[PDB]
Amino acid sequence: HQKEVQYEILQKTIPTFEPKESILKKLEDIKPEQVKKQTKLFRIFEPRQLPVYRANGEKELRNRWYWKLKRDTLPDGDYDVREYFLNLYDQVLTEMPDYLLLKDMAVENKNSRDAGKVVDSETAAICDAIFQDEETEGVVRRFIAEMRQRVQADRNVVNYPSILHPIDHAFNEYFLQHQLVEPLNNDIIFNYIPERIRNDVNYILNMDRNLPSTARYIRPNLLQDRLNLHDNFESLWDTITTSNYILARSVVPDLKELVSTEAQIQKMSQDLQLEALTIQSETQFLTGINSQAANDCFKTLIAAMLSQRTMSLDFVTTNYMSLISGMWLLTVVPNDMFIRESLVACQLAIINTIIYPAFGMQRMHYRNGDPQTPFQIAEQQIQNFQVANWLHFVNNNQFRQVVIDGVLNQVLNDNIRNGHVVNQLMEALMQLSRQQFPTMPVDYKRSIQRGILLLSNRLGQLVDLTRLLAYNYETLMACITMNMQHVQTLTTEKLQLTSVTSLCMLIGNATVIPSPQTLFHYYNVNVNFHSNYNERINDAVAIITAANRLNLYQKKMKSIVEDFLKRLQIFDISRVPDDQMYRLRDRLRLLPVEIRRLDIFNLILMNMEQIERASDKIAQGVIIAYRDMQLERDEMYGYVNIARNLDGFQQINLEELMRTGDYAQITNMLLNNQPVALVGALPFITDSSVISLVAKLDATVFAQIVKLRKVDTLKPILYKINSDSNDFYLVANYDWVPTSTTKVYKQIPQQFDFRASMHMLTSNLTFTVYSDLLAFVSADTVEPINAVAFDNMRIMNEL
Amino acid sequence: MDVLYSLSKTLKDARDKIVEGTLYSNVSDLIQQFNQMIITMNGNEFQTGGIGNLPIRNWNFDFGLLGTTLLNLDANYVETARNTIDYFVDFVDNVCMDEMVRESQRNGIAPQSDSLRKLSGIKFKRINFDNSS
Amino acid sequence: MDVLYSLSKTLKDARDKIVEGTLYSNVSDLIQQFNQMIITMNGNEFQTGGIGNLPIRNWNFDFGLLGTTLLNLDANYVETARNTIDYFVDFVDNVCMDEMVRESQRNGIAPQSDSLRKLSGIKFKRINFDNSS
Amino acid sequence: MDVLYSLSKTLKDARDKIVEGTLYSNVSDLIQQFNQMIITMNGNEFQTGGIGNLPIRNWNFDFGLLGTTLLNLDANYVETARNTIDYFVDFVDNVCMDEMVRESQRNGIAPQSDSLRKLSGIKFKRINFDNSS
């Protein structure tokens, strides 16, 4: 019970989904980055006809075209405006197209006299409106009637006329100029296959498909780990290795034509003569020796080596057959693939139960934490060449590190790959079969020696098994795209030495190699996971950098990191330690932003002020000047208390006033009638009443600031006095200058200019984008009987 | 002096790097700095003095930003950039000449021309970038 | 001239910046410019002439692009870049030598060698970048 | 030598480009290189000068990284960067002086000072960047 409690305490800090196997589905549901196509041009502005007024305030008989936000939904408060622009950045990133084909958006130009087309239907509406307008220039009208698209099918190019606001043109032009589609051909697909599988003679790869010059594809972002999650992220790395282990288990092949379990069990029982001994565990000795255990051992070993997930050894010391099999396990599997305690325990059991007793040596008094493993001490303390040489190999058979195609790989000693070292193992244990075991009881000695011979006499089968395991490991490792970082994980995969015995005693001579489709599926899953990892890193970094550069100080990067981890699809975020979350936040902060997202952010940042000042429901500030200032004459309002700039006034930032809560300065200035300029995104009341101006109601909207110590309810008055006012006669029929003591800091809409809005958008006429490159590869395999290893000899030679 | 040097270096980099056909990645940071300079200088009135025979000159800044969305720079981009670059270069040269012809005894290291004194304000500190000469 | 200078400047920057162990962020723009130069020059045949004792040399460009998927440049990247850089430097030196030994009364400002006249076509203007000398 | 030059070049760029008010885009790559240098040098002990009257200087590197979150550099960023740059510049000057005063008949081209010998290791090769002098 206590063990379960402690293990649950440890596991609650690991974001691994509790039904480990289910992780496989979550890994295989990750698809390639969804290919986004643009259906209409991106627009933030539209041309709109607005009434205009003469200098005397009388509405004119014609409307004028101005640029207005299509969706005017900007909030009040500077911080809220910056949050709105961050949301706009997220929207643009999510809806950013990966490629564009303008012909899809091309529509008939009604006024064209030469069968002209334009992109998009909004451009057609704008062009018709300008064409029908009476105030349009004759030259502009004739150009609309004559402007033409140019479709060059031989060159695969299309140019269309478009009407776009300069910001809209900037966005659409960036989309057109920076598409993610690359030309696709058979050379690209052939090089997409892992290089070591293309060189493997056991796999026949053919290109029985013809790719047109119009074929396209999007390159996966296989950038290596920028977060270095293998370093100082114990829980996240545990989860990553667990997911990789599950996937590798899914792709490891199944053994065929194993030795009959009944025959091998009877052989082992007859040789060991357990019933004749006095062992308290007579039945348990041969339990777990079956074909299922052998397959489980094969899968566990190869998957653990592929995922670089630490393994623990579970064995019963009294079962010396398990130790004899563990000798082979330590011969073939690198010693650093096991948790130090398990390796030490297994090696010490082997030393103190078999090897040292064999040579009449005093049992080793091994001290935990010794820099030397028990086998390292035994190598120096044992004089026999066979056993000492085998011990030397087992001591020095750690993984070697090599970078292939930019991917770090953990590779085996060449003696493991060809299976030759098994001979040495055999040699060593053959010596152990001839040893006296000086003081050991003779029946137990006979049983131990006969088990040693049980393993020894399978030399050919064990060489074949070692070669098969190494070949499978290499072939599946060719499909790994992320660096194989070796880290001792928090939790391990428990490997039963009885399963090792099953694999050693039941392996036949049926070569089983990964299917070409299995290799392609494994490589595709790895590529999808790596690409999603990189893309979500890019998204998180872009959003964090945008929030910091937008001065969104109340933004919590914790939510961004949680969303990033959730989109990685393999983390239960509820079990991520907080220190690791904050370390992830810091490391994400240190990364630079990806070029495309950074360019989009630069566009939004440079156009922020123009977009905000185009809003009709927020003003940029309010000047309280207790002198009487004439109402300005503007074509958009008539008379209006509009400030073109804040020059000549002390500026109080309303956001800073809200954040600090110190209203002493503002209160002192309002009480003493000190001219000031309150700066910040403010809602305003449009007042068309001349009587309101005479009553001076615009100067009565600031006492609530002092009363409530709030600035969120500040709604300055913006007078709009023109002939449409019910009391405009007061302006017209009397000799006076309309004045006010307050002005609203706001901008005037930009006029629509046809010359500045007409652009030519250029794209390709058509192409087809492909996702599964490996579907273009016809992959066959040789007969397993004829499968060869790296040394050009058959994987299994016992035949 | 730092702001004046930054203006001059931005203009020199614009002349050297804004060339037809060049990848925008070769000028992205330069275009960002140039747009920052335009934003900081916009809406400001400057006067270069009438000391000696140097004529009084007035300078206004109401320029638009440069594009940032092309894969390669074209002729239109270069001409649009040059129109602004010529004005900015003329302003910088006139400010430099106005500062070069003035001297003071109490504080000779501080700016002498009113244009450079204005440019020494905090609001122009944004223009400052790489000081390598 | 601008294209030839841009080739020389790109090669000098590749020699100086593409070094083992350097961050890819230190060369991203340089790598993009280098790859653009490779794309533009690939598939083109040049001849540096036999004027005087200068030997006739034929230049063919079939080079792979430099990778863009590293965090720090390694030995493989540097060697792969250096082979191409050596070939391009030899080509540029030969083109410069061919141009230097030529003159004309009519259009002596215009290119004289066949290689530089070919490089004056629009299909090479993409190579053009920072002109700071 | 290349690592020492890269240290000096990074420090010169930091002194010239990390200035108050400058756009972060003007330093972003430089900030990445600077942080790489800080990470590489952190946790390393150096000793310079035991020949002639050159004093024995001991150097420890425990510095925090520069931020990447600002739009324009401010006073705090510049002060932190300046402190780190001052320490690194003093270290580089002392290492250069230590190397300049030594000589060898056999391998005079090879590093002579222990600091440069340590810097010639692989663990410092990451510091290497643009070699343009």
mmCIF file of N, CA and C in Angstrom, chain A residues 169-171 173-174 177-178 595 599 602-603 605-606 609 647, chain B residues 24-25 28 32 35 39 43 65-72:
data_model
loop_
_atom_site.group_PDB
_atom_site.id
_atom_site.type_symbol
_atom_site.label_atom_id
_atom_site.label_comp_id
_atom_site.label_asym_id
_atom_site.label_seq_id
_atom_site.Cartn_x
_atom_site.Cartn_y
_atom_site.Cartn_z
ATOM 1 N N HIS A 169 -3.643 45.784 -48.911
ATOM 2 C CA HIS A 169 -2.702 45.409 -49.955
ATOM 3 C C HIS A 169 -1.423 44.850 -49.357
ATOM 4 N N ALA A 170 -0.934 45.449 -48.272
ATOM 5 C CA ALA A 170 0.274 44.941 -47.635
ATOM 6 C C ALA A 170 0.083 43.500 -47.187
ATOM 7 N N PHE A 171 -1.038 43.218 -46.522
ATOM 8 C CA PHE A 171 -1.286 41.860 -46.042
ATOM 9 C C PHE A 171 -1.406 40.875 -47.201
ATOM 10 N N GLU A 173 -0.364 41.158 -50.309
ATOM 11 C CA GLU A 173 0.899 41.044 -51.022
ATOM 12 C C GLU A 173 1.886 40.185 -50.249
ATOM 13 N N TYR A 174 1.918 40.317 -48.921
ATOM 14 C CA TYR A 174 2.776 39.434 -48.142
ATOM 15 C C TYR A 174 2.348 37.984 -48.306
ATOM 16 N N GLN A 177 3.508 36.839 -51.782
ATOM 17 C CA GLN A 177 4.950 36.812 -51.984
ATOM 18 C C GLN A 177 5.664 35.774 -51.130
ATOM 19 N N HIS A 178 5.012 35.232 -50.105
ATOM 20 C CA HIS A 178 5.653 34.355 -49.131
ATOM 21 C C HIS A 178 4.833 33.092 -48.925
ATOM 22 N N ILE A 595 10.241 33.931 -39.104
ATOM 23 C CA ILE A 595 10.281 35.082 -40.006
ATOM 24 C C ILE A 595 8.877 35.483 -40.452
ATOM 25 N N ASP A 599 7.157 38.997 -39.498
ATOM 26 C CA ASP A 599 6.776 39.969 -40.518
ATOM 27 C C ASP A 599 5.316 40.375 -40.371
ATOM 28 N N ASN A 602 5.127 42.714 -37.503
ATOM 29 C CA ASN A 602 5.639 44.032 -37.863
ATOM 30 C C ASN A 602 4.600 44.817 -38.647
ATOM 31 N N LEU A 603 3.911 44.150 -39.573
ATOM 32 C CA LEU A 603 2.857 44.814 -40.333
ATOM 33 C C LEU A 603 1.766 45.333 -39.402
ATOM 34 N N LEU A 605 1.952 45.923 -36.179
ATOM 35 C CA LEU A 605 2.472 46.933 -35.267
ATOM 36 C C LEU A 605 2.600 48.284 -35.954
ATOM 37 N N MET A 606 3.076 48.297 -37.201
ATOM 38 C CA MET A 606 3.251 49.568 -37.894
ATOM 39 C C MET A 606 1.920 50.152 -38.345
ATOM 40 N N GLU A 609 -1.575 52.224 -35.318
ATOM 41 C CA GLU A 609 -2.054 53.577 -35.058
ATOM 42 C C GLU A 609 -3.086 53.997 -36.097
ATOM 43 N N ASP A 647 -0.382 69.193 -28.875
ATOM 44 C CA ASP A 647 0.692 70.143 -28.625
ATOM 45 C C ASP A 647 0.207 71.289 -27.747
ATOM 46 N N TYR B 24 14.208 41.281 -49.660
ATOM 47 C CA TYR B 24 13.790 42.105 -48.533
ATOM 48 C C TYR B 24 14.465 41.666 -47.241
ATOM 49 N N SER B 25 14.854 40.394 -47.144
ATOM 50 C CA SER B 25 15.566 39.932 -45.960
ATOM 51 C C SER B 25 16.912 40.623 -45.803
ATOM 52 N N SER B 28 15.439 44.070 -44.123
ATOM 53 C CA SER B 28 14.304 44.058 -43.205
ATOM 54 C C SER B 28 14.573 44.919 -41.976
ATOM 55 N N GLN B 32 12.944 48.511 -40.975
ATOM 56 C CA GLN B 32 12.339 48.755 -39.669
ATOM 57 C C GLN B 32 12.915 50.012 -39.029
ATOM 58 N N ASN B 35 11.580 53.100 -40.911
ATOM 59 C CA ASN B 35 10.206 53.414 -40.536
ATOM 60 C C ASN B 35 10.139 53.995 -39.131
ATOM 61 N N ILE B 39 8.553 57.619 -38.286
ATOM 62 C CA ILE B 39 7.526 57.815 -37.266
ATOM 63 C C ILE B 39 7.986 58.842 -36.242
ATOM 64 N N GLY B 43 5.602 64.977 -38.063
ATOM 65 C CA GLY B 43 4.904 65.971 -37.280
ATOM 66 C C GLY B 43 5.786 66.989 -36.597
ATOM 67 N N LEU B 65 5.344 55.454 -44.544
ATOM 68 C CA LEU B 65 6.315 54.404 -44.291
ATOM 69 C C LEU B 65 6.649 53.656 -45.578
ATOM 70 N N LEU B 66 7.735 52.891 -45.526
ATOM 71 C CA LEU B 66 8.149 52.061 -46.646
ATOM 72 C C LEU B 66 7.509 50.684 -46.545
ATOM 73 N N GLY B 67 7.299 50.062 -47.701
ATOM 74 C CA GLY B 67 6.706 48.740 -47.716
ATOM 75 C C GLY B 67 7.610 47.712 -47.066
ATOM 76 N N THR B 68 6.991 46.644 -46.561
ATOM 77 C CA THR B 68 7.716 45.572 -45.892
ATOM 78 C C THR B 68 7.252 44.189 -46.329
ATOM 79 N N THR B 69 6.580 44.075 -47.476
ATOM 80 C CA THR B 69 5.866 42.858 -47.841
ATOM 81 C C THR B 69 6.278 42.293 -49.195
ATOM 82 N N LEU B 70 7.408 42.722 -49.748
ATOM 83 C CA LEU B 70 7.910 42.166 -50.995
ATOM 84 C C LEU B 70 8.993 41.134 -50.716
ATOM 85 N N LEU B 71 9.078 40.136 -51.597
ATOM 86 C CA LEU B 71 10.176 39.180 -51.523
ATOM 87 C C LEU B 71 11.471 39.796 -52.038
ATOM 88 N N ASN B 72 11.386 40.587 -53.104
ATOM 89 C CA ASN B 72 12.519 41.320 -53.647
ATOM 90 C C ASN B 72 12.097 42.751 -53.934
#
